[PDB]
Design a protein around this ligand. Structure first.
Ligand SMILES: [Ca+2]
Ligand SMILES: [Ca+2]
Ligand SMILES: [Ca+2]
Length: 317
């Protein structure tokens, strides 16, 4: 509703930007501020035009140069910014699954918050890039009910449109209420089938009906009736169906509120949402947490890494 912080620049001159960036890198050292002052003030599409212009104006490769000159978390953010939107998601999913470990939080976040149409583009691109099925990789990297949720989301087969079947909304709400009072454990299949199959309008109506019949929010019941990564995935679906901006505020809060910082999450959220809904994220952050997002980033990061994240945030003093 308020939208993003990062917008398409006016007066955009790709060749001039190419020259600014080369000047920033050429010779010993780097002018990191100059890099920020260009890249954080162009949108992702414009940054692709810079890449093209850099080859033809400078006779070099921009990403290669950035990678050579920069390091650490600042390099990660800048290279992130330079990556086409779909490919960035693809590469984040790959990173989350590569090796014996898994970044489960990353999988949840992307697969719960992207639309089916976005998931299909991601899935296609992952297949083309790696010659691997996204669904098959997810299936390998996760287990049990958590796997069922993530495989379903990755398959991108949720009902679409906004058709409202009042009788089915009622039935679903009742079914979820009963699934929670089954004698020998929650019926987790009912939860995951409703939450993974139904269209958004329908689910928003189920959530309201569930509260009407149970006097409890569906999130409260999820928290008391499920556990583990499976719980976390179901909560992510619900939160994303209600208000994805709020979900991402929560993701940012959790990435910073502890001792230390979940940089991978902070970076991905800030890069991936700066053009979509960062102003809404900021608003919801302030409501939930009574502090500005800006102040959290300022307090938990430093250096050029801080600088660029604060430009992505927008604001604020
Ligand atoms: Ca240099
Ligand atoms: Ca793995
Ligand atoms: Ca911290």
């Amino acid at each position: 509703t308020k939208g993003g912080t990062v917008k398409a620049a006016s007066g955009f001159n790709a060749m001039e930007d190419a020259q600014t960036l080369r000047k920033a890198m050429k010779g010993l050292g780097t002018d990191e501020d100059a890099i920020i002052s260009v890249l954080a003030y162009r949108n992702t599409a414009q940054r692709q035009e810079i890449r093209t212009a850099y080859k033809s104006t400078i006779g070099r490769d921009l990403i290669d140069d950035l990678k050579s000159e920069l390091s650490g978390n600042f390099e990660q953010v800048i290279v992130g910014m330079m990556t086409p939107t779909v490919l960035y998601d693809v590469q984040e999913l790959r990173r989350a699954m590569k090796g014996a470990g898994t970044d489960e939080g990353c999988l949840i976040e992307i697969l719960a918050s992207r639309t089916p149409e976005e998931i299909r583009r991601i899935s296609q691109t992952y297949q083309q890039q790696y010659g691997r099925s996204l669904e098959d990789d997810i299936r390998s990297d996760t287990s049990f009910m958590f796997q069922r949720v993530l495989v379903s989301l990755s398959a991108g087969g949720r009902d679409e449109g906004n058709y409202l079947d009042d009788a089915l909304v009622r039935q679903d709400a009742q079914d979820l209420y009963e699934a929670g009072e089954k004698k020998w454990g929650t019926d987790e299949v009912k939860f995951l089938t409703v939450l993974c199959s139904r269209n958004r309008n329908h689910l928003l109506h189920v959530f309201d009906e569930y509260k009407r019949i149970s006097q409890k929010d569906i999130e409260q019941s999820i928290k008391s009736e499920t556990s583990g990564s499976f719980e976390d995935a179901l909560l992510a679906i619900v939160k994303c169906m209600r208000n994805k901006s709020a979900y991402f505020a929560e993701k940012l809060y959790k990435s910073m509120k502890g001792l230390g910082t979940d940089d991978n999450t902070l970076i991905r959220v800030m890069v991936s949402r700066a053009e979509i809904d960062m102003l809404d994220i900021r608003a919801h952050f302030k409501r939930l947490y009574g502090k500005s997002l800006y102040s959290f980033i300022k307090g938990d990061t430093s250096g050029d890494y801080r600088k660029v994240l604060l430009v992505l945030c927008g604001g604020d003093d």
